[PDB]
Design a protein around this ligand. Sequence first.
Ligand SMILES: NC(=O)c1ccc[n+]([C@@H]2O[C@H](COP(=O)([O-])OP(=O)(O)OC[C@H]3O[C@@H](n4cnc5c(N)ncnc54)[C@H](OP(=O)(O)O)[C@@H]3O)[C@@H](O)[C@H]2O)c1
Length: 315
Amino acid sequence: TTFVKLRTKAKMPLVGLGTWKSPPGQVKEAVKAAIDAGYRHFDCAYVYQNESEVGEAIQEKIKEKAVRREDLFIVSKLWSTFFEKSLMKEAFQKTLSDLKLDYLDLYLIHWPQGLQAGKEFLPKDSQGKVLMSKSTFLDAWEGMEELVDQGLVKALGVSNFNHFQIERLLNKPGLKHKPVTNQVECHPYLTQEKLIQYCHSKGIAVIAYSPLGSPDRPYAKPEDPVVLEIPKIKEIAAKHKKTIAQVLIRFHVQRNVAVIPKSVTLSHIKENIQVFDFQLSEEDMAAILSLNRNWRACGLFVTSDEEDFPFHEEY
Ligand SMILES: NC(=O)c1ccc[n+]([C@@H]2O[C@H](COP(=O)([O-])OP(=O)(O)OC[C@H]3O[C@@H](n4cnc5c(N)ncnc54)[C@H](OP(=O)(O)O)[C@@H]3O)[C@@H](O)[C@H]2O)c1
């Protein structure tokens, strides 16, 4: 109930703790507090640059006997400047080393377009144009598959992929490890009906991020739709004696979609996991689903004209 079983028949907890934009130090405390509140799924990434702080938190809770490594699901992601196999292996060893773990439960392609290798996460030319690499997500996957055969990663997945891109991966000549999740932005204004149906029927679980609409996001504008403030959510929240955020998170759990709300605030961290004590009615689920406007806050929009750009397609 609190988990979705992957194609491997590993259990992925339905609620996890997101880590993007959590500052260093705040993150170590946030992860400690989350473990204490019963979180077992953690989502971290090389490009966040806070993995070391996550790793400290986990090591300390394991040392203290609060949790066993086998009951944690720890996810990280390969950034798009490291698609080329040797660079992939270096990036990965740094992620695993920062996290202080012997293996990851899940390793994701972060973004389907490859970017030029170098020190910058977002390489630009003198003009300020983003530079792409020659390596594709299929090249990166061949590299990642070796991690699985090695026991360093239990399963591979993708993030921000459309269904044609997943098909291409599923139809890759010589594919060894099928992807087990697709981690995409998901909330009442971007429900992802078709993408979720596609994933579940292809052996692929879905992890929702930005379930709260990613308010901390740096480029938020007054004109943007406001996920927290959806009027129907307030109504449903009052009815169930839960918070608006709790309803936004349950909306994902109740569809058997994992969610990774981000928080470094203790009250919010404890509250976000209190979503296994109520059920949304069929009318409430239909009312939430009525809200999609296919609106996205998250992605690399500057590269929309470059070959691998996922958000052009319907799903
Ligand atoms: N491309 C990708 O694959 C990708 C992209 C973006 C994110 N992600 C992952 O998904 C996670 C979630 O995305 P997100 O971080 O963009 O946004 P989000 O989880 O929707 O929203 C986070 C924001 O909401 C606040 N918040 C959390 N709980 C709350 C509550 N109960 N009530 C009110 N406010 C609350 C947080 O502040 P406090 O911290 O103070 O609580 C933070 O400002 C990321 O951290 C990361 O792990 C993946």
